Design a protein around this ligand. Sequence first.
Ligand SMILES: C[n+]1cn([C@@H]2O[C@H](COP(=O)(O)OP(=O)(O)OP(=O)(O)O)[C@@H](O)[C@H]2O)c2nc(N)[nH]c(=O)c21
Length: 75
Amino acid sequence: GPLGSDHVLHVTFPKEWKTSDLYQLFSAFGNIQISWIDDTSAFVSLSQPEQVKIAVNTSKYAESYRIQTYAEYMG
Ligand SMILES: C[n+]1cn([C@@H]2O[C@H](COP(=O)(O)OP(=O)(O)OP(=O)(O)O)[C@@H](O)[C@H]2O)c2nc(N)[nH]c(=O)c21
């Protein structure tokens, strides 16, 4: 939630495309939801892992090491 960012994007494509094409196109992402606009366009919402935030968060589970952002290091 803080570990993944939610995005909505706009996609234009050929009329011949189906749901599966958009799922394939965005397969690098999580929680993909298509909101069709018309024959050749859709909004797509998705979740993108935030690898830096995840590395920081995961460090809390280890006593031996801690990762923090430069901002947290300051504050
Ligand atoms: C499923 N689908 C929907 N559209 C466009 O979106 C309009 C309404 O889409 P719809 O009534 O077929 O599904 P809806 O979006 O309501 O619900 P969903 O299937 O659960 O997402 C259609 O009139 C088309 O213009 C689509 N357009 C293309 N090109 N390919 C598709 O597979 C497709």
